[PDB]
Design a protein around this ligand. Structure first.
Ligand code: GDP
Ligand code: 4ED
Ligand code: CA
Ligand code: MG
Lengths: 67, 422
């Protein structure tokens, strides 16, 4: 009975610790996934704007090849 | 010298325990300060049974006060006979048990139990000849139920050859604090079946009915309920605390009352429950009446294995003997025929306060199964849907332990039904 008393209280500790472990990992996964997604969102936005620069330079270059 | 160590655990256990000490201290003539101021040497002849003699001729109860929260024990220390208790014998935590058997038995209570055992050991070591242990508690809560039975388990390990008796308050939906009371009670009963010699089953439903139907109290409080318990506990311990014809310790009393190890759950009774004194026939009639039973079980639904009856006051012992022989010979169908002379009677000259004479009933009836059946119904009603189980599994318990406790009490019930049809 004594060793059962030990098994119960250490099962309580184990479950409480696993809950904290899972929560910490799930949160770390989400904040990391979010960081990658938001950066990629802004990376794609700036790349389009940097594409407008490439197009604008070709416009001025195309006019330059008419003079 | 036949010393008894008293232990009280939890809210109910301590409030009832305090009232018990409040009552017997009055009977022995001990004031709240611990000084004796009686009027008879008979009050001191067996004073050592429940009291330790202090340095300055004071009498300090051999009591140990246990709780997981300081709330109730602060109330005791601030009570009438609060200063009479040994300060070191106040063992308490801070967390509480939250009406949870698991917290009392496995987690919170486990952290405190060794501290209690040290006090128990300290009291036991200073006993010339330890007679046994005595626990007051409820089974529906967390501390008295969970830690109470854990303490019993520990005491049986350290004192395997000592008598372990309990005054256990059974939960009831009529007088309830939480819905998990049947869970806590079922878990505790399994412990009591194996680890106690005598358990006085005090049903709060019975106590409520007595206060309402008989005592004509419209709104019974716990205080009113504990008044009945206090008076019963005084009566049960009367022959142990006072000189008389009965020369027996806890063991000898257990031997004559318990024919089967597991079947040791008694139905307490008391009479009267007024200026007009009762006659001996009236005492005997009421004493066997269901309305004076405190286990909320009808004795006519079962049979008596053994019966003990204690009369207090100056009365015709011949008339008492005749009246006891009257009830038995008028209702012989309710007493088992395979145990000759199973009804024993003792008389004490000193009556309790307020009454010129009284009577206390101790019945080992098979009708007590009605109480366990009732608890088992309430248990199964929730457990079949695994309701409120998360409170317990969160403390490390498994569903299997519940299934096992449920099965052991159904076995207990079946065991009682076995001897009812004998
Ligand atoms: N007779 C009586 N029963 C009580 C008292 N206090 C609580 N109870 C019962 O005991 C159960 C609650 O257990 P409790 O002792 O309060 O919890 P604990 O402190 O963890 O042991 C409920 O079923 C209540 O009906 C009391 O003072 N007198
Ligand atoms: C036959 C008989 C039995 C009996 N048993 C008693 C129990 C006393 C007790 C007190 C405190 C704790 N545990 C048990 S009183 C009594 C009186 C008679 C006649
Ligand atoms: Ca702690
Ligand atoms: Mg309570």
């Amino acid at each position: 009975k004594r060793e059962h008393e030990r098994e119960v209280i250490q099962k309580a500790i184990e479950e409480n610790n696993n809950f904290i472990k899972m929560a910490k990992e799930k949160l770390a996964q989400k904040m990391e996934s979010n960081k990658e997604n938001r950066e990629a969102h802004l990376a794609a936005m700036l790349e389009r704007l940097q594409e407008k620069d490439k197009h604008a330079e070709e416009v001025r270059k195309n006019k330059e090849l008419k003079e | 010298m036949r010393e008894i160590v008293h232990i009280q655990a939890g809210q109910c256990g301590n409030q009832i325990g305090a009232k018990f000490w409040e009552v017997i201290s009055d009977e022995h003539g001990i004031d709240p300060t611990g000084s004796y101021h009686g009027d008879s040497d008979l009050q001191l002849e067996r004073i050592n049974v429940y009291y330790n003699e202090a340095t300055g001729n004071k009498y300090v109860p051999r009591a140990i006060l246990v709780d997981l929260e300081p709330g109730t024990m602060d109330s005791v220390r601030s009570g009438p006979f609060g200063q009479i208790f040994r300060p070191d014998n106040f063992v308490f935590g801070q967390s509480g048990a939250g009406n949870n058997w698991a917290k009392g038995h496995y987690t919170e209570g486990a952290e405190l139990v060794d501290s209690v055992l040290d006090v128990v050991r300290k009291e036991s070591e200073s006993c010339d000849c330890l007679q046994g242990f005595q626990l007051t508690h409820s089974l529906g809560g967390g501390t008295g139920s969970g830690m109470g039975t854990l303490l019993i388990s520990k005491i049986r390990e350290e004192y395997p050859d000592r008598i372990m008796n309990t005054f256990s308050v059974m939960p009831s939906p009529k007088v309830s604090d939480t819905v998990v009371e049947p869970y806590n009670a079922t878990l505790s009963v399994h412990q009591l079946v194996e680890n106690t010699d005598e358990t006085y089953c005090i049903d709060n439903e019975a106590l409520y009915d007595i206060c309402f139907r008989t005592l004509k109290l419209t709104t019974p409080t716990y205080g009113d309920l504990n008044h009945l318990v206090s008076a019963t506990m005084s009566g049960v311990t009367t022959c142990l605390r006072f000189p008389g014809q009965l020369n027996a310790d806890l063991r000898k009393l257990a031997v004559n009352m318990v024919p089967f190890p597991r079947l040791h759950f008694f139905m307490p009774g008391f009479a009267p429950l007024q200026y007009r004194a009762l006659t001996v026939p009236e005492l005997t009639q009421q004493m066997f009446d269901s309305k004076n039973m405190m286990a909320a079980c009808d004795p006519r639904h079962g049979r008596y294995l053994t019966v003990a009856a204690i009369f207090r006051g100056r009365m015709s012992m011949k008339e008492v003997d005749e009246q006891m022989l009257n009830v038995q010979n008028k209702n012989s169908s309710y007493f088992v025929e395979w145990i000759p002379n199973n009804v024993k009677t003792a008389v004490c000259d000193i009556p309790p306060r307020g009454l010129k004479m009284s009577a206390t009933f101790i019945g080992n009836s098979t009708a007590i199964q009605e109480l366990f059946k009732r608890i088992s119904e309430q248990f199964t009603a929730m457990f079949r849907r695994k309701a409120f189980l998360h409170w317990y599994t969160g403390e490390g318990m498994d569903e299997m332990e519940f299934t096992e406790a449920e099965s052991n009490m159904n076995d207990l019930v079946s065991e009682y039904q076995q001897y009812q049809d004998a």
